[PDB]
């Protein structure tokens, strides 16, 4: 997809950030939007033409495939990236509001709240789309998915395309989700002392 | 298949046995002999070939077909055919080394004792056969086979042929198996009595 204006407000929020918040948008930039662009689309480019299940009944492959994977793994990815970056567009916002203000007439006073609940929600929704993925697919993809959703005649054996790469990449992206939390920490901590 | 050896000496046997023993040879060529021949064996003749599984495993088929018929019934009738006309054929061969030794030199003495042991052996042959049919496969064929034998993934749904027309020709021959059983009891009796 093209990201392009996110990254716009994402690189003004650069500016009117700390340190490690520059730290954190350079992770997000790099080891998740680009890896999901550059690498992770073309594994998950054919994870339904190449789900195969063995049988003969029409319609059988569809709702296996639907029942394996509600969501897809690079869909929700799209999402948490979309979500972690909301809070930021926000106080990124409000800073620019008391900018204007003050022309009409760096983080202290209001800002600072603002930015320590941008980091708070942050933190929240990371956190969120970890325990989530966990529930929905653990953190292993395993190559054979038994079906037994009508029209499947008892229970059918499916198989999964690209299971061990798609593996990879999802403790990838927990790894990249993990150390973006860890980020986090650093932030409120820093601030606090 | 050709019976005509089986005839002829059947036929012989025909003269040397009591008036209900001719009824039962009438009942056994007509019956169960022709009615194999002329109307069963085609109702069988594509027991394989229209047996069909959903499943795209080869072999699974085969193994299915096989464990839901062991023996064919077609194949099953013939042989009790062949096992209930046997003693007759003992007796009537007891009877003709009677009638050669007495050209060296009806029914009593050695030959009653014969002839007698001849209904016994029918009637237990005839009820050894039904019993074992009965526990092989019911006296129902149902068109639908569940079969979980190897190379068969999970269980699979199978489809027999023309499942009610056998089970017509069935509950035929067990009928006609029955109505020789009592022509067998209706001997032993008319003799005692
Ligand atoms: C402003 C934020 C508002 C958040 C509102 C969240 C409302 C969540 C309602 C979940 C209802 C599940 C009902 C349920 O359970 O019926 C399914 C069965 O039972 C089960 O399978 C057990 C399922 C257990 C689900 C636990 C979900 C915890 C969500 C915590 C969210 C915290 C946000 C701060
Ligand atoms: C279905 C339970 O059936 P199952 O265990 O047999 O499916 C097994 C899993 N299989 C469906 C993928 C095969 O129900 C579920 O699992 C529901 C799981 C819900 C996962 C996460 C929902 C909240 C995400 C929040 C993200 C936003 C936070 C800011
Ligand atoms: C900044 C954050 C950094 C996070 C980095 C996380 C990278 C995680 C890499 C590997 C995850 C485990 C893969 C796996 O769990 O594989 C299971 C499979 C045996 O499973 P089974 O089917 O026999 O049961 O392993 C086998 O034996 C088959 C051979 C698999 C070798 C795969 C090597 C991947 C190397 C990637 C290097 C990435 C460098 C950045
Ligand atoms: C001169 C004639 C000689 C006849 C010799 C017949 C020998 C039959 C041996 C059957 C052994 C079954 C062993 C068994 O049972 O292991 C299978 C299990 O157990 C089960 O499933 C229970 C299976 C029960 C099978 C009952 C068969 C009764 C056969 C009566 C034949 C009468 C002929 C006059
Ligand atoms: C297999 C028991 O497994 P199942 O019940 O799951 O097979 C279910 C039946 N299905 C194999 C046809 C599907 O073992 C059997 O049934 C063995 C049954 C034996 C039937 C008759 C054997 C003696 C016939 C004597 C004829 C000659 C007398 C003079
Ligand atoms: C000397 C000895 C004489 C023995 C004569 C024995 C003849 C036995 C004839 C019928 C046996 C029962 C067939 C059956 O059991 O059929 C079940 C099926 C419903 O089963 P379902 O799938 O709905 O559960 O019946 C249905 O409704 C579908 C329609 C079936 C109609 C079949 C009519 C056959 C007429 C043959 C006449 C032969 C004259 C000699």
């Not at 690498?39 to 296996?64: K, L, R």
């Not at 009508?150 to 990449?169: G, H, L, Q």
């Amino acid at each position: 997809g093209d990201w392009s204006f996110l990254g716009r407000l994402l690189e003004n929020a650069q500016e009117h950030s700390t340190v490690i918040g520059k730290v954190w948008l350079t992770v997000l930039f790099i080891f998740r939007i680009l890896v999901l662009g550059a690498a992770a689309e073309e594994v998950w480019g054919d994870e339904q033409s190449d789900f195969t299940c063995n049988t003969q009944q029409p319609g059988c492959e569809n709702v296996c495939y639907d029942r394996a994977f509600p969501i897809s793994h690079v869909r929700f990815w799209v999402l948490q990236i979309i979500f972690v970056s909301t809070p930021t567009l926000i106080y990124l916002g409000h800073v620019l509001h008391l900018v204007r203000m003050e022309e009409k007439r760096r983080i202290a006073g209001a800002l600072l709240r603002t930015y320590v609940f941008n980091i708070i929600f942050k933190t929240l929704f990371e956190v969120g789309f970890i325990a989530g993925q966990y529930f929905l697919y653990g953190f292993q993809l395993k190559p054979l998915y038994r079906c037994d959703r009508w029209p499947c005649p008892n229970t059918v054996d499916c198989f999964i395309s690209r299971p061990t790469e798609k593996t990879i990449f999802i403790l990838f992206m927990l790894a990249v989700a993990c150390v973006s939390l860890l980020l986090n920490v650093l932030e409120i901590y820093h601030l606090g002392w």
